[PDB]
Design a protein around this ligand. Structure first.
Ligand SMILES: Nc1ncnc2c1ncn2[C@@H]1O[C@H](COP(=O)(O)OP(=O)(O)O)[C@@H](O)[C@H]1O
Ligand SMILES: Nc1ncnc2c1ncn2[C@@H]1O[C@H](COP(=O)(O)OP(=O)(O)O)[C@@H](O)[C@H]1O
Ligand SMILES: [Ca+2]
Ligand SMILES: [Ca+2]
Lengths: 232, 375, 375
């Protein structure tokens, strides 16, 4: 408690501002950052924080003196608000809440790791709830700070003209050999069968799990022609 | 609770041990430090006596116990007993193994270098403690308020410490160590009671004095005026029917013993009252440091709960000292656990890694590893 | 305010720094020049001490600060500290970046050539300053009245300067540099106080002397007649109850120290009183230049606010010097900021372009660019 806000600040700048991915005024000579504030880089942009009330608001420490009072009261609700002791959270009771909240977030991560989640991400049209109006800056920003177009170049792989495997399949079916319902099932062996029978080098193409990757448009002509001079 | 090693919190003294579970705010188990023999012969077969009796077990039945004091300021007459005293704390109540969680202890300033290593030897070699530390009493009571500029006076049963720790620690001498706390008060009363005939001889009833003391006894505001008050039998004659069966009207006996605090001349020493030692720690430091010291004086230790202990300070300090600033002494209400409040912190700090000792660190720099690097 | 780069105004000395926003008339922030360590150990964890403490932060709490003086006339014991002293001024208060606005500084006459380049290196290389300059103290206090014919004597905490700058600058020697100002006065009093017993030892209370000085202390009109006056206890015994708590009756101590000004014999030197040095700067110049010099003598520096500093000049100057012209000394009332008033001007001048230094100009002529071209 004797380390208020100014002293606490000094315990951050020294501990960090050397470890990568964290700036401030001192290291990064930028006037936008106050001498009492700092620059925290997220996976998106830049954010600066104040210090008003940091401690009392963050401490959260809730000892068993304010809690026990209501428990010993005489009312069907006052003690009812404190329901049957130990609901999905027991272990041991007497301990600062600083660690209790730390367990709350840990109960969120551990249970998400070992499973098969599903992804859903939404974007807002506009702040005026209008059906037809698109705010370019706001929308573009959302696509930016979420890093979705990067996945379009990573989750995919990154280049110019892109096509799938599943959608590419039901389109060029009658242009390839041994790519019919009689397929073995193995994609890695299927894709190779598609190219090896037309005599094409290995490194010329790049195959992941989904999305086919051919660099530069001209190569598409190279494919169209390779098929032309092998069988009239 | 479960995840993360989770460290315990403890604070051993020379009279009362403070220890609880982990991540707590206050001590959960405070057993007395007593261990004697059955000078008598136990029934000898009605158990193979041994156990000098300890914990609530011994304190409950003193009668047939020759309470032998092991730890007397600095020197421990015997370490063998301490081993089985700590084998009770972590297990019989806490029900947790030290071979799993770290450990935190307190450091009695100016304690023989050989002692801090003897203790650690018990942990690292037998109780396998890869992580522990021993912090300094007073400094813990500090880090728990809201300022980096206060003088602290922490004491209890061990020895008195006048530590002006605010901005930093250790410079010329300032700090003081005085063997005159708790146990000393319990030992002095029995001597003075002999004037009236009462003579609590053996060391068993010696403890009863301490028990009775912390219920009615108080400190003399001014022995001169209170002496003339003796003529009356209202504020003096106090009632306390011995649980045995013999009233002891502690009238002029209550505010007689505490006078020794301000007058160490009654215990064969040249040490002056605690208000002189205050000057002794202020006059040494810089000149432009005083005005703010008087504005903040931390007084920790349950010993400072005697009625008439704080109001006297304002009378003697304002006398022979500069008098143009804000004279102000912070005497925390429950100032006995002030060390325990700070203890729970150090055990949870991460910077603590910069200070604590790791298993391998004890072997690389030898036993002196502790106080050879830190302070 | 917004349009046009807009330059700042500053004036650093060896005791007090004067700096404010831009286009101002007077300094907005005048923080003291102090930076010491915690010889003590900071609480060491109750912040990673470092910051020797500075600004209103250090001055507010000297107590636990070993005030280390970096700049002593010419030699800077360490430059590393100066870097973080300037990192506080422009930002913590002014809230403006030097990587945007020009900068103006003062030049201590006859300062090692290596120093003027070391400073500029900090700006051009790190703080990226495409435009700045360092003007000469006294000359600034000049250009701010209504005549081109006056002699100036500017000084404060650094060193004394008798600069007869009126029609031009620099010819034979005239000008003088004397290490005897501000800091010298603060250092001399503590030595003389030892005769009465008072001994402000450490460098912290050393500053208290300076603080107390500028409230009551005054200069002796004639030490001979004032000595006989000591018999009385009205004009001598002055009251100043130490904010700590001990009155110091500064009676014959007030007008004792200032006597050193007129009598440098008390500080181991052959330098004569400031009224002889006046002749030393007048006798050198032409013969038909004097009659108008006496008619105008500029006295700048807050040091010249001591009661009994101006009236003495008329007594000693009229003695051993020509006496048929108008003896007249211009001692501006608030003459401490006389340099700051002139500073705001140079920063706004356009002809200034003929004098200042541009980014590229520093690389073409090397580091010496400054005092290798200008004077
Ligand atoms: N309510 C109380 N009022 C006054 N003294 C008390 C009170 N409770 C305990 N004490 C005293 O405090 C002392 C024990 O304090 P403690 O902080 O545990 O000491 P130590 O740590 O030095 O062993 C004993 O002298 C005891 O009599
Ligand atoms: N009101 C005042 N009366 C007399 N001396 C003063 C007064 N205010 C400040 N001073 C003195 O002026 C000196 C500081 O003047 P300054 O012009 O800032 O000096 P420098 O620039 O040489 O550091 C200090 O010696 C201080 O005690
Ligand atoms: Ca103690
Ligand atoms: Ca000066």
């Amino acid at each position: 408690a004797k380390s208020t806000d100014q002293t606490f600040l000094d315990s951050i700048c020294k501990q960090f501002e050397k470890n990568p991915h964290l700036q401030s005024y001192v290291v990064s000579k930028d006037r936008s950052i106050g001498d009492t504030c700092f620059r925290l880089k997220h996976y998106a942009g830049d954010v600066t924080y104040d210090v008003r009330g940091f401690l009392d608001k963050n401490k959260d420490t809730l000892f068993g003196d304010l809690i026990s009072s209501m428990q010993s009261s005489s009312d069907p609700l006052v003690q009812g608000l404190f329901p049957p002791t130990r609901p999905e959270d027991s272990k041991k009771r007497p301990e600062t809440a600083g660690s209790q909240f730390r367990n709350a977030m840990n109960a969120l991560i551990t249970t998400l790791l070992a499973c098969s989640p599903h992804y859903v991400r939404c974007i807002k049209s506009n702040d005026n709830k209008q059906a037809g109006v698109i705010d370019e800056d706001r929308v573009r920003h959302q696509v930016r700070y979420l890093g979705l177009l990067e996945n379009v170049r990573v989750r995919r792989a990154g280049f110019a003209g892109r096509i799938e495997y599943t959608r590419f399949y039901n389109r060029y079916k009658m242009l390839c050999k041994k790519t019919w319902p009689s397929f073995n099932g193995t994609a890695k062996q299927a894709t190779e069968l598609i190219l090896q029978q037309h005599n094409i080098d290995k490194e010329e193409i790049r195959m992941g799990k989904t999305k086919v990757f051919i660099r530069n448009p001209t190569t598409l002509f190279y494919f169209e022609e390779k098929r032309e001079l092998e069988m009239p | 609770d479960e995840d993360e090693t989770t460290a315990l919190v403890c604070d051993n003294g020379s009279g009362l041990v403070k220890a609880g579970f982990a991540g707590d705010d206050a001590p959960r188990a405070v057993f007395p430090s007593i261990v004697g023999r059955p000078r008598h012969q136990g029934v000898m077969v009605g158990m193979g006596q041994k156990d000098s009796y300890v914990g609530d077990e011994a304190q409950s039945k003193r009668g047939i116990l020759t309470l032998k004091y092991p730890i007397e300021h600095g020197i421990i007459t015997n370490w063998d007993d301490m081993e089985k005293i700590w084998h009770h704390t972590f297990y019989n109540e806490l029900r947790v193994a030290p071979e799993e969680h770290p450990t935190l202890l307190t450091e009695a300033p100016l304690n023989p270098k050989a002692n801090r290593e003897k203790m650690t030897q018990i942990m690292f070699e037998t109780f396998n403690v890869p992580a522990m530390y021993v912090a300094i009493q007073a400094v813990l009571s500090l880090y728990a308020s809201g300022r980096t500029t206060g003088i602290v006076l922490d004491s209890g049963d061990g020895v008195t410490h006048n530590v002006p720790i605010y901005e930093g620690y250790a410079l010329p001498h300032a700090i003081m160590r005085l063997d005159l706390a708790g146990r000393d008060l319990t030992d002095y009363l029995m001597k003075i009671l002999t004037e009236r005939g009462y003579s609590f001889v053996t060391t068993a009833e010696r403890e009863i004095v301490r028990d009775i003391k912390e219920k009615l006894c108080y400190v003399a505001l001014d022995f001169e005026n209170e002496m003339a008050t003796a003529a009356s039998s209202s504020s003096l004659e106090k009632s306390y029917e011995l649980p045995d069966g013999q009233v002891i009207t502690i009238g002029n006996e209550r505010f007689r013993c505490p006078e020794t605090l301000f007058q160490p001349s009654f215990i064969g020493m040249e040490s002056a009252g605690i208000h002189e030692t205050t000057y002794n720690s202020i006059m040494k430091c810089d000149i432009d440091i005083r005005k703010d010291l008087y504005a903040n004086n931390v007084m920790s230790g349950g010993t400072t709960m005697y009625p008439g202990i704080a109001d006297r300070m304002q009378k003697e300090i304002t006398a022979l000292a500069p008098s143009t600033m804000k004279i102000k002494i912070i005497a925390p209400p429950e100032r006995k656990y002030s060390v325990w409040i700070g203890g729970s912190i150090l055990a949870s700090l991460s910077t603590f890694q910069q200070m604590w000792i790791t298993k391998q660190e004890y072997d690389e720099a030898g036993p002196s590893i502790v106080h050879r690097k830190c302070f």
